[PDB]
Design a protein around this nucleic acid. Structure first.
Lengths: 57, 96, 223, 107, 67
RNA sequence: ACGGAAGGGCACCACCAGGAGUGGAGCCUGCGGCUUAAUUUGACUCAACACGGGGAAACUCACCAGGUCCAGACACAAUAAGGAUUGACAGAUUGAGAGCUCUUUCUUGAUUUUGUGGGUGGUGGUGCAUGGCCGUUCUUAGUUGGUGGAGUGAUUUGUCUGCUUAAUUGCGAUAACGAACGAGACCUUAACCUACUAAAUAGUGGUGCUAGCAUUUGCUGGUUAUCCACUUCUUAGAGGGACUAUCGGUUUCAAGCCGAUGGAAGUUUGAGGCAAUAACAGGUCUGUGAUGCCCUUAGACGUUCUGGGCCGCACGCGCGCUACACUGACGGAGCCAGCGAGUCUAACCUUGGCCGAGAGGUCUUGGUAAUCUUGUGAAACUCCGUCGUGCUGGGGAUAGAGCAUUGUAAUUAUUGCUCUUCAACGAGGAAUUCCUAGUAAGCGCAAGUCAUCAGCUUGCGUUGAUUACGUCCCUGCCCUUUGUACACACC
C-alpha cells in the first residue's frame, strides 16, 4: 500500500472491524444407519462362502 | 503400490471400521501397531487413498494422522461391497 | 509406568507440546485458541478452546469422535482413558494466537495488508485491550523483502509484567510468491486481572484525603 | 460397616506452586477439620531441572549461552484414617497440574 | 548510584503535599503510613518512596523546597 | 546520513598501577596451505579459526570406489486373463547366503508394467528471493504524544549551557507545562530470621540397649523406629528486613557524592533474567514435514548396503594442555567441598563379598531417589620422610613389548593397565589477551556430548593474593558544533 491512499485503508479496515462485531453479535444468540462393521461381519458370519479340497500323493 | 490384495483388504477394512488411522514416519518397521501388515504398506496405501480424495492426511511430529472422508465412505463402501448405510465410527458409541 | 517424577513431568510437558501442535494443525479454520489437559481418576481430559465449536463437533459429534480416536490410538490409550471437550473461548480479541490466525486468513483471502493489520488491531482494541501490535515481515508483490509495524494503544516491553500481561504469537503464512510472518502482541488490561496482580509495579495511587471542618471548642458526648 | 485405620501417605508433586500449596494446605486443613492423626505437609528440596544451550540455530556469532529451567516442587502428607474419607479426599480436591499419588504401605 | 527515579520523587512530593498533618522525620512511621495510604505493589518501591519523603521531610523542617 | 573539520564525555572487549599469562618449547585442537579416488561443507577484523552444541571407527555423512531398491500419489492412454506383473532353489557371477545379472522353469494373478501429463524426494543451488531464529551497533541511552509558544511550511521548543548518576538518572536553568515506551520498577538466585508452620525421605537433646578406656560421676562409639521431647543446624511455605539509615563533612547547601557509626548486607546489596525505536544485503535454505524460484528425479543429486575418507603432511596462523623444578618431584600419612544425574517395557547410577600388581573379572545389593550410589573420604592443600641443584629422582615427547575394557568391527594404532625407551623445554624476540574481592589466579568435580573417547564447554565449590579507586596518552564508541552538490545516504 501507499500513503496517498491511507485514509481509505483505515476506513475500510474500521468498517471491517464493525462488520466483525456484527458477526460477533449475530453469534451472540443467532437463529440411524446401524449395522456397524464388526457386528455386520458377525451378522453375515453365516457360512456358504468357502471351498477347499486337495492334497495329491 | 505393489502389495498382495490381502494386506490391502486388512487396510481398507480396518480404516472403514475405525474411520481414523495413525502411522509413524518410519518405514522398515516390519509390522504396524494393530494392523497385520508392513508399516510401509499402510502408509503408502493410505497415500493412495488420500491422493484420490477419499481420505485426508496430516503429519506433525513424525506421525501420520489419517481421517476418512464421506466420498471415501462411498468408495470404501464399494470396495467392501457392503450395503448402503453400513458402518464407520458414525454411530455415537453406546451412550458415551 | 514406574518412571521417575522428573522424567514424568518433562514427559507431561512434551505431551502437551505434541498435543497443542496437533490441534493447532488440525483445527486451523475453526478458531482453535489453545488446549488444556487434566489428569483425573477414570479419564484424562482434553479441553479445546475454540471459537467455532459447532464445527469441532461436526455432524452430530463425528469429528470430535475422530480427534479423540486419533489422540487415543496415537498416544496408546485404552478406549475411555481419554475424553475431549470442545469449548468456546471468551473474548477472541485478547488471545494472540486467535488474532495471528485471523490476519493469516485475511491475507490468505487476499485482503490489503494495511487493511488487514489495521482491521485486526481495530477489532482487538474494541474488545477492550490495553494495547496491541501486529508486525508483518516478508515479501509482498515486490522482491526485496520488507517489514511493517502496526501498533495501537499501550504496551510495556520489559520485566516480569511481560509474562503477566502481553501475549506473543508468530505465524507463518505462505503464498504464491513466498512466505511472510505475522508477529502479534496483545497487552491485556491489568485492571481487570481477576487472578494475579491487578496493576503495574510502576503504579502508585495516592488516596485523596478530606477537607476537614476543624476548630470548635472541646466538649464531650455521653452514651 | 467398613472403616478401619490404614497408615496413609499422600504425595503431591507439581510445578505450579500456587495450585500446589492451594491443594496441599486445603488437604491438611480440610482433613484435620475432623480430628485425624497426621504429619502435615513435608517439603522436599525443590528440584531445578536445568538446560544449557547456544541461543543460535547455526554456529555464527559471539558464543551466547542460555539456561532454561523447570522447577519441581514435591510435598507429602501423612494421614491415619479409614477407607471412605481417603477415597473422598482423593476423588475431590483435584487440580490440573498438581499430580496426586495415594500410597497405603508400611514397608 | 542512588539517584532516586522520577516516580519515587513524584510520589514523595504528592504525599508530603497532602499528608503533612501526619508523618515525621522517622522512616518507620512514614513507611507504615504509606502502607495505610498509598497502594504500592512493592515493598522495595514503598521503602524508596518513604525514605525519600522522609529526607524531604527533614529538609522541609529547616526551610522551603521548590515544588 | 557522512567527514581524512572543532569542543566534549564514557569504558580494563581503553590506558594507568599491577597481577596471571600467551607469543619461544612438546603435544592437544580448529583454520589455511599442500597432498588426495575422496581428503564433504558453512564462517575470515572487533562481530571467522575448543564456532555450527562439529569429542566422525559403522551409523552420523553431506565425499570418494563400488552394489541394490522405488517408498515414480494421481489422470488419460497402451499391454493383457491364451497372463498386465511378483518371487526364487543351485550354479555361474558379486565384497557379500543380492535370483543385481544370466543358465534352467517352477511360480504369482491384474496389486504391476510401457508411455504422456502430473507428482514426489533431495545436508542439490540461491541467507543477494523469504519466514523464524540468532549475532552486531549496545559494557548503549534513546523513542513518542496532549495543551501551549515559534514557523506559510517540511519542522522546531518540550527533548537545554551547567551540575549530578550506571542511566533523557536526577537537580537546576527555562516558553514551556504535565505525561507514556525504554532505564528504574519487576522477576530469579546468593546473603539475615533461637520470630510462625512443620518433618523416620532432615537433624538435635534424653532415655532404653550395648562396646572400649577410665574408673569417682566421666570420656569416645554402636543400635533406619526401643520410646519421649525438640526445630539451634537441614529442608520450603507465608511473612519480616534496607529506605544508601543516624550523625557529620562537601557542592549552586539542589541532585547527589565522601567519611565515621550501626547493621545479615550500604559498589544498581553481590550476580543474572528480561529489555523500546532503528539499522546490517552480519549468520543460518547443513535443525525443521518453515518456504519462493531454479536444478536434479531411475546409469537418481532419491534411498539403502560394502569399503574408504573428513585424522591424510615440506609448512603459515588461532584456542589450548603439559612443563622447564627445591613456595619442588617422589613416598608415606593427615583429610575437607558444592552444583548434578541416574533402570519400563530395561540393564542406568552401583555400595558391599571374594579374585587380580594393575586395569578389570566375578558373586550379590540398595536406589525411578532428600530414603540408594554418596558424607560423592575430589584436588590443590596439611604433616614426616627421601632426594640436593647436576638436562637431576625436574620434564614426559617419541617408541618397542605384554594385559584388559567398549563395541558387529579398534589395523591408520577408541580408552584403560604394566615394563622399558628418557626428546624439546635453563622463564622465552617483536608483538598481544584477561582481570579490581572470596574477584584474579592455582585446584578438582558434576553436567552436556557419550556404546567406547575431554587436553572442550556449561555450571560448581575448594585455597585465596598483589595493585587502582584515577585519568583521556594509545584505542574503541557516544554526544553536540560545523560543512555537504549525499538521501539507493561515502560501498
Amino acid at each position: 500500500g501507499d500513503d496517498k491512499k491511507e485514509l481509505s485503508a483505515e476506513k475500510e479496515a474500521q468498517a471491517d472491524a464493525a462488520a466483525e462485531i456484527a458477526e460477533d453479535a449475530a453469534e451472540a444468540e443467532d437463529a440411524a444407519k446401524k449395522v456397524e462393521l464388526d457386528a455386520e461381519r458377525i451378522e453375515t458370519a453365516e457360512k456358504e462362502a468357502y471351498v477347499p479340497a486337495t492334497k495329491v500323493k | 503400490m505393489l502389495m498382495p490384495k490381502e494386506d490391502r483388504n486388512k487396510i481398507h477394512q480396518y480404516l472403514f471400521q475405525e474411520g481414523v488411522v495413525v502411522a509413524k514416519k518410519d518405514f522398515n518397521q516390519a509390522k504396524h501397531e494393530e494392523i497385520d501388515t508392513k508399516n510401509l504398506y499402510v502408509i503408502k496405501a493410505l497415500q493412495s487413498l488420500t491422493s484420490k480424495g477419499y481420505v485426508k492426511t496430516q503429519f506433525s511430529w513424525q506421525y501420520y494422522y489419517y481421517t476418512l472422508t464421506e466420498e471415501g465412505v462411498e468408495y470404501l463402501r464399494e470396495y467392501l461391497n457392503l450395503p448402503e448405510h453400513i458402518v464407520p465410527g458414525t454411530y455415537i458409541q453406546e451412550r458415551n | 509406568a514406574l518412571i521417575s517424577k522428573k522424567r514424568k513431568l518433562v514427559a507431561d510437558g512434551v505431551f502437551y507440546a505434541e498435543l497443542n501442535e496437533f490441534f493447532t494443525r488440525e483445527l486451523a479454520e475453526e478458531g482453535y485458541s489453545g488446549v488444556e489437559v487434566r489428569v483425573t481418576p477414570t479419564k484424562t481430559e482434553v479441553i479445546i478452546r475454540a471459537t467455532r465449536t459447532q464445527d469441532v463437533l461436526g455432524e452430530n459429534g463425528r469429528r470430535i469422535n475422530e480427534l479423540t480416536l486419533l489422540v487415543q490410538k496415537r498416544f496408546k490409550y485404552a478406549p475411555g482413558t481419554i475424553v475431549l471437550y470442545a469449548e468456546r473461548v471468551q473474548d477472541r480479541g485478547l488471545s494472540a494466537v486467535a488474532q495471528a490466525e485471523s490476519m493469516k486468513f485475511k491475507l490468505l483471502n487476499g485482503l490489503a495488508i494495511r487493511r488487514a493489520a489495521y482491521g485486526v488491531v481495530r477489532y482487538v482494541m474494541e474488545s477492550g485491550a490495553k494495547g496491541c501490535e501486529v508486525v508483518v515481515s516478508g515479501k509482498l508483490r515486490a522482491a526485496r523483502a520488507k517489514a511493517m509495524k502496526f501498533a495501537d494503544g499501550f504496551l510495556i516491553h520489559s520485566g516480569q509484567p511481560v509474562n503477566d500481561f502481553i501475549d506473543t504469537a508468530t505465524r507463518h503464512v505462505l503464498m504464491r510468491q513466498g512466505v511472510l510472518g505475522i508477529k502479534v502482541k496483545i497487552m491485556r488490561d491489568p485492571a481487570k486481572s481477576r487472578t494475579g496482580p491487578k496493576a503495574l509495579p510502576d503504579a502508585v495511587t495516592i488516596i485523596e484525603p478530606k477537607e476537614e471542618e476543624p476548630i470548635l471548642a472541646p466538649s464531650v458526648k455521653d452514651y | 460397616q467398613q472403616q478401619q485405620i490404614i497408615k496413609i501417605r499422600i504425595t503431591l508433586t507439581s510445578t505450579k506452586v500456587k495450585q500446589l500449596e492451594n491443594v496441599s494446605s486445603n488437604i491438611v486443613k480440610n482433613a484435620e477439620q475432623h480430628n485425624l492423626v497426621k504429619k502435615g505437609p513435608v517439603r522436599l528440596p525443590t528440584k531445578v531441572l536445568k538446560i544449557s544451550t547456544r541461543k543460535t540455530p547455526n554456529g555464527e556469532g559471539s558464543k551466547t549461552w542460555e539456561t532454561y529451567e523447570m522447577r519441581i516442587h514435591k510435598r507429602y502428607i501423612d494421614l491415619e484414617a479409614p477407607v471412605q474419607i481417603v477415597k473422598r479426599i482423593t476423588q475431590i480436591t483435584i487440580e490440573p497440574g498438581v499430580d496426586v499419588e495415594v500410597v497405603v504401605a508400611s514397608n | 548510584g542512588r539517584v532516586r527515579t522520577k516516580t519515587v520523587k513524584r510520589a514523595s512530593k504528592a504525599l508530603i503535599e497532602r499528608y503533612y498533618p501526619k508523618l515525621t522525620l522517622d522512616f518507620q512511621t512514614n513507611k507504615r503510613l504509606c502502607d495505610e495510604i498509598a497502594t504500592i505493589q512493592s515493598k522495595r518501591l514503598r521503602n524508596k518512596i518513604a525514605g525519600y519523603t522522609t529526607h524531604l521531610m527533614k529538609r522541609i523542617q529547616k526551610g522551603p523546597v521548590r515544588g
